[PDB]
Amino acid sequence: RAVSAKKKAILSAALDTFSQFGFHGTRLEQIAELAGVSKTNLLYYFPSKEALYIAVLRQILDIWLAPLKAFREDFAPLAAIKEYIRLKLEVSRDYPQASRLFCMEMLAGAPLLMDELTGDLKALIDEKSALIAGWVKSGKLAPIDPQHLIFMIAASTQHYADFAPQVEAVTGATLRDEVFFNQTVENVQRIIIEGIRPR
Template identity: 55%
Template sequence: MDEAAAQPDPAQDEEARPRTRIQRRNTQAILDAALEVFSAQGFRGATLDQIAEVAGLSKPNLLYYFASKEAIHVELLSGLMDTWLDPLREMDPEGEPEAEIMAYVRRKLQMARDYPRESRLFANEILQGAPRMRAAIEGELKDLVDEKAEVIRGWQAAGKIAPVHPYHLIFSIWALTQHYADFDMQVRAVLGPEGADPFPEAGRFLDTLFGRLLAP
């Protein structure tokens, strides 16, 4: 037996060892700080020094938990994908078609309200060509959209909703909901005082817009 192969791997031991409460707290502080910095500065504009400062840690301490800026970014993005896809996963093929699509619109608008930093993180990654998410976008995301597009086609074939291109319907839902997170400052500046909370009126507008679009 190869003696070297029999030796324990220190890196694996470190990964297998349960993290202490302080380690878990610091890891979460780094990820929260990185989300703030990346969503504002983008990947290229963000620095480890900025992330460490927002996290309230020294840069050497940060590097104890994550080896690089990219490692932090990848960790954030990998956790984001499930959150991003869950609203579409909830679209029920056995449900009432227009109600299911309108519920999806509402869930996406709620995500724009509750997770604006995550939305901007995702948008920044896409604008850069998705170098750290391409596999997930071309795999998991595309597979789910393909699946739901077939559901929408089935509803159209049954005459339950108007004939619209299913992919462009989904794209339009993304565009008209995520806009309120990605362009929050612009939305509030244009609306002025009445834009203090644009989401209730946005919800009513989107209900009307997609309700008319989908009516058979």
């Protein structure tokens, strides 16, 4: 539908522009241009830059939360962990803009995202941490702290998007190279699962 196509285009154009230039650096003229709509039209859907930035971040949180649902009581623990890693790397491959802007927002103190971090994201991480604790407690995983394990996977998988140019300077590849994508998944899993001490 026309109305929804427009606002889908505004949100997507805004994500690209805000991650490229930051909040303060971004102007609404640009987002409108890229979305192929008038400014008054953009203002109709989103009555200020701050309103639109917020909607964008809410969309990014959703993208961000989704992978954690790989932590299910019905998956074998290592399959869950492998899937969480894979899903997170898919985010870095497919939504690097989102990953980047999320990074930029966190670096600024999370001035607009603090509420979400103390709410749903925390709730979800506490929930999955408890689940992993039970896998540890029952001997299906080695004795490790679940919060540190989740942060490590998050940090490691996100790095490939956020710092893709640095990774490319060193490796000669990005996650858009499917061989590099496969190697990356394989190595992050292999390191976290098997460890680097020989078995």
